[model samples]
Target: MKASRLYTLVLVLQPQRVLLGMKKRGFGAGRWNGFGGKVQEGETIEDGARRELQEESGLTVDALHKVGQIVFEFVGEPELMDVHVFCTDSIQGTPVESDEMRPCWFQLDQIPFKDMWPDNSYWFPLLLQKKKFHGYFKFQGQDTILDYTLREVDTV
Candidate 1:
C-alpha cells in the first residue's frame, strides 16, 4: 500500500536532543528522534506538523520554521515517507508521554542510532548548517545508505 508519511523534526537549542516519538508495539519503541506522523488528507504540512508535535510532545511549538523535506523509499516497505523537518529556537510547555511515544530528551552527541530510522546522522548536519535542503534516500536499514543527492541549502 502507498502511504503518505509526513513529520517534523523539532530542534531545540544547545542540549541538542531532537523531539522523537516511538511506537510501543512497532519497530521504534526505545528509539529517540524527532516528533511527527502521517498527514491527514485535508491538512496542510504546517497543520500536520503542529498536530503531530502536540500529539507526540504534548507541547505546542511557539513557531516552526520550515527547513526541508526528505523522502525515503525502502525496498520492501510501502512507499514510505515524505518527511519534513522543522527547527524551533524555542518551544512552550513540557513533554509528556502517549500511547505512541514515551517522550524524552536524548543528547545530540549520543543519539541512539540503533533505535532511530537509519539516515538521521547523514542529513541532520544540514539542519545544523541552517540550510534549507530537499533530497531523497534509499536504505536497507540503519547502517546502509544506498543512494542520495544532497545540495547546499537553496534560497527560498
Candidate 2:
C-alpha cells in the first residue's frame, strides 16, 4: 500500500457564523471549503492547520480545538489523504484574500452546501452541534462519493 498524506483543514468561527473560502486555483479549485493544505515536515498537525489558515485566509489562530479526522480515498489512487480538521473562534487577524482562496463568512444556518465539497456537508452538521467526529469517504472523482461512513465521538 502507498503512504497516507497528512493534510489539515481549519475553520474560523463565531457563535452564529463560520468562515469558508472559495478556492481560486489548483486541486479542489472552484469549490468552497475551509482553509488548509498538506502538513509540512517538522510541524504538528495543529501547527500545520494554523499555518495553512494564515497562508490562505490571512487570519492567525492562536489555538484550535481538534474536531474531526477523515480519510479520503479516491478510486484508482493508492495514496490516501489523512485530514485533521480543527476550528477556533479566537483569531488574530481579519480575513483577507490570498492567492489560493477568497475568505467569506456565512450564517450558521445558511452555509452554501451546494457549492462545497460533499464531505464538508457530511460532518459540518456535527460541527455545528459542537460534537467531535470522524469520517471516511471514498470517491469516484471530485463530485461523487461512492461510499462513506461518519459518526460523532466524545473526543477527536
lDDT of 1 at 28: 41
lDDT of 1 by residue, 29-91 (tens): 566667777778898878788787887778886578888788887778876778877776678
Give the number of the best model, judged by TM-score: 2
Candidate 2 per-residue lDDT over residues 1-156, each given as its tens digit = 668999999877689999999989888788889889999999999999999888888888778999999999999999999999998989897899878778899998899999998998889998888899999999999999999999899988
Clashing pairs in 2: none
Shift in Å, residue 135, candidate 2: 0.3
The regions of model 2 sitting more than 4 angstroms off are: none
Q: Looking at model 1, report the run of 10 residues with the lowest lDDT sum.
A: 7-16
